[PDB]
Amino acid sequence: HNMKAFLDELKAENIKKFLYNFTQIPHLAGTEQNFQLAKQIQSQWKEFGLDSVELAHYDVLLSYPNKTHPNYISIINEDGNEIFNTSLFEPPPPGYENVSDIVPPFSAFSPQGMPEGDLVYVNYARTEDFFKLERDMKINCSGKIVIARYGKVFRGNKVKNAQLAGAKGVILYSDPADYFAPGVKSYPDGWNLPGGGVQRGNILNLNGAGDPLTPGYPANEYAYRRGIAEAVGLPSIPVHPIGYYDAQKLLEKMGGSAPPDSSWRGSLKVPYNVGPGFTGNFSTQKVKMHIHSTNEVTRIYNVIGTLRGAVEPDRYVILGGHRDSWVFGGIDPQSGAAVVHEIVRSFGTLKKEGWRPRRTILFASWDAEEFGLLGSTEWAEENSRLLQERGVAYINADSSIEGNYTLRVDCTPLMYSLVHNLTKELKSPDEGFEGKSLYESWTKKSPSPEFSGMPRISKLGSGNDFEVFFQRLGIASGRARYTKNWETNKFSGYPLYHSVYETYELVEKFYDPMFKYHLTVAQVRGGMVFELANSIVLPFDCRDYAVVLRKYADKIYSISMKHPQEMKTYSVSFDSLFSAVKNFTEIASKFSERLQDFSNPIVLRMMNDQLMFLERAFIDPLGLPDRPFYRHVIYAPSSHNKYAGESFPGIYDALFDIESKVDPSKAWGEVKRQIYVAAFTVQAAAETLSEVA
Template sequence: MDQARSTISKIFNGEPHSYTRFNLTQNMEGDNSQVEMKLSSDMDEEAGGNGVGDHLNHNSNRKPHAAEKPGRKPKNLCFMVAATVLIFVIGYLIAYLAHGKKDVAPTCEASVDPVAEPLERETGAAPLMNWEDVKKLLTEKLSAAKMEPVFREFSVVNHKAGSKGDESLANKVLGKFKGYGMNTWTDEHFIKVQDAPAAGANRFVFKGSAEYSKGFLSYSANGTATGGVLYAFYGQESDFQLLRDRNINMTDRVMLIRAGRISFAEKVANAAKMGASAVLIYPDPTDYPIGDSTQLFGHVHMGSGDPYTPGFPSFNHTQFPPVQSSGLPKILAQSITSAMASNIRRQLGGHNEPETWGGSYKLGEENDAITVEVNNVLAEKKIHNVFGVIKGFVDADRYVVIGAQRDAWGAGFATSTVGTSLLVELARSISDMVKNDGFKPRRSIVFASWSAGEYGSVGATEWLEGYLSSLSMKAFSYINLDRVIKGSTGFKVSASPLMHGLIESTMKEVKYPDSSSTLYSQFAKINFESNVLEPFKLDAAAYPFLAFSGIPSVSFGFTSGNLEYPYFGTELDTREKLNVAAGNQVPQLAETAARFAGHMVLRLVHDHLLRMDVMKYNNIIRNHVVQINTKVYSVKRMQPQLLPKALTVQWLISASGSYGRVAQRLVTDMQNSDLEDIEMCRIINDRIMAVERNLLSPYVSPRDSPFRHIMLGSGPHTLKALSNHLDGLKNDHPESDADLFRNQLAMATWTVQGCANSLAGDIWALDNEI
């Protein structure tokens, strides 16, 4: 109404001499609203004279009540018609607007509903809390005493993926997140996994004696295989190379292999390359003092996620092509106990095993026949991932993800209970800091509880597959809480090189339990990289985030030196067993682990610019390039017919140089940036985030090579594989192929150059010196 009056006033250059009265009523049965409009003016007074035109002239000398003669001038008639039409149009528009509001309920409650005040958001770029105060707040929230009740709440005897125990834990986690005032949601997946035979058990027959095993390895091929037993130590590539050097036939042999050092899947894949027909994996007492009858459980998928929907999420009612992951083995694989393995080894003949392997037994010969029978059952399971988010106050659409596995083969105390408890405690602590202590994270924090981790990070990988295009642009790091306590005398971290600096600084801030020394002074000592950092293992829960999705990731944990925690993959992973391995310091170590993870999370969402060192990859790329260049010249010298004279590594060298220059330019931009400029900070952070995902090779299929990272992935597309391929060419290995090498070299070159281009930012800032 006010707008209509204002419009009339502007048209007439003064206060209107009419008023408009509205009476809006709504027909409750759906009839159109009626608009009653009454216009009153001095029309009678203005009937004489020059009409509306003169009425607008406030200095007119005309008498207000002078009567006009019947014959009016055409000009005055035009003015009156125009005024009438104008008033009609305005009235029609007002009626139309009133009619458009007919659906507004005429109740008093609707008009007085209080509007909820939105949560205050930061409008400037300056941090709203000093970092020292943030650290102090987190210290106050976490304690060893608070860990104990959480451990008890989330300790469950049976919580295999998809079971009622797993679902019950999911609901507990969801309830906690809701109780902390977080926005929550769940993801439901229908996955296919292999379980042990519903009736009976898998078995093997050796020297006329049959043995049955309760343990099993999911995703093994099914069927029966017979062959001579061959002991292959840990089943590493170097172990099989040693057997090959001894001219031992490995075709159709049944490999007997120790657990440890590499994943079950890698052992089986390496054996398959040698032409083996089956693999038996056992826990040797030297590495696993767990009793000679303890069963092992695990999987042998050379990948992660549901292998029956490779590259696709396992959502319900979705149609995908009937394909299987290339990482599924085509040979049999079965776990056996230490006692079963000892009985086999005592009866083997053939060559003596190498002294470096122990030297006490024979390797086995082809007439040491054994029959292996595997009858695993393919089953569909419904699993749930549970999420809660604390939204950021500046860049809410950028987030760090912190997650933990929820399922286990048995009690799984070290496997999942500790991680789930830490996840919940960190969610409680940080939520409380935001709600009650004034902490305002710049970016968001997503807390995730995964299922089906024991089958190969299935829950986490299905989530990544489902939202890959979004996550690769918005999730800037992943912090894994699985298996953070395996001992107490060591501390190991696997991480993206981008995060090494953040890890080192965090270790200098977090103290070791019951000590005045920090984690850094306790474990890093002289050399941080050699004493703390270790490569990612293929079965690490954070590995798919890094090598499949290109999200900088970190896994960490307290260890017992170089010894593995022996109860992973068994039903003996209990609180009591972990207490012994951790020196009865489980709550204290859990508190420290929570602080370590919490400090990294908070630093990543507190600072204006992401704490990631883009120059780290420069040294790694250069080292690979130097190695490849040296080997190319070596092959040309020793096998000149394999590689053309024109072939050089100059393009790869140039791409490496491009990366180094744009990385240094970004460091300079960060140093010279105006932290008050929110948009500039966001642009720089997006350039940093682009590094990891652009090191994923765009030339390989996730189905064939899911871990596409050319530095840290696995497959022929990696720079390490290029170097190994040159070794094969040099030694005339039958699987080496000069044309394939040249193709892979070209793809790796343009992956590095593409990463450099992305890091440069704007198209006009590209490094064109290649």
């Protein structure tokens, strides 16, 4: 009864069966079918042997198209006749043409409206795309409908950016340049997005708030809800996603200015003119959106499984991933949920033979992730006192695969050593690495840019259910999945993401026929939970935080040093931050020595508490500026792309575009304030590792 027993019990064939089972019908959040699936998971986790399995439910703001009043976009002529209409649905894939309750493509939480106007093409609608438009090109988006390609960044940032540019609507589309890999066929004959395929997804800017109506507090039965007008993160202009057949029709007539350069051109046979409006012959034609989706408070269900710890039941290691899908969820999330299901089954096998982990393991099937991480966030809001005093670690478990090339891990520095050690003990599933370790294949395919013989591990970003646990509550967090080769494959994400084409057959035929990558990811995720819940000394190495803190301090200082004159004028020094990082390095080194030298369970637990509370020490209870739920001072989601992690985010945002600020004294004053906050927090975290008295 050790890790090897746990790992060996995991079967690829079981993960295949579960994936099939979870993907036959849609499981949209707030729907009866997803509630049925919740009850099924609850039943099976009980059967599998967990001590308790409960549903935790909340009533949250969700968004759905109107069934009798479909969303669509038109080209209208001067008479007002709609001469072109975008599709009302994606052509269903082979054998699914009769499946009901496929939600049609829509942008969740769009307000209703029917705006009419001239089109401006804004590339990926990134901060720098708008800078280029407004500052360099002198194009005004005010009162225009913007059309943007999907890709590069989170769609909610695109919508925010369009809105602050004064757009009156946004059209999102999938360009083949970003969603069609050269030499691969469209679904069903390959893994590419067809011209009628469309990516669903919410366009909120929640910044960690969870349910838009109840920021800070669980959306329970007696919750007081904000009015819609005061809700968090809702867009103020209508938005709708389309495919590249329909996008071609909308782009082909575009006039005004040429694209500023080739990074603005996708792969369609159109000029990619920025606009505004259409070329001469069609200059009186306009674009009209028709959006009728409604926001509604709807009940959602998390499944929470508990396997009580034998020695420290008041210490919680959490494995959590979501269950709700846009349609069938073939990759997102069921390729993760099937992996969790088999992990539970394996732990349960051991439990039935009399074993218990040292610490409590909690297993979560979250609801409403697709609508803003709502299930994980409301539950963490409800249980925040328990999680901040008892939470050892959170391992996420959304999609197990986004490619078939190599491992991807994003995690706190505290888990680097755990991940290196675990992967050295696992077999690579890769062709040409038979009998080699996962560590070897991973390091070869994804080398660290700093360190020879080490793999690359990214910072945690967001756009997934670890966000409340890591950036709000400061619980050490990690995620892992198989991924594509980004060096040779330039497209954004996997092509069929959040489309009807993301099915069981997508995975079984193209991504992972033998379910070996799924099994590899079950071993990584399950292996991590096993070590975290069972190792006598928590498997965190504080010295790895010291190394990255120095790298981040160098980075942020380099950004500021682009403005040497202002640093002189305003006396901007990074000395305090570097001093704090030096102290952290020295104190962590001494703590590591002590952790090596000590039969005494109090000294042990005292030291496990120092390891556990070290991630927690990076939390500032005041939050980051205007983002009260992003409280971690080292890591926040990028203010320009929610998916990307930013380091020293407080100083980063204070420096961003600082040369354009009206009051340089005020702006540089705020840079110095953020330096102070960062240096203080680093020193305060270091001091939690000092001898306690």
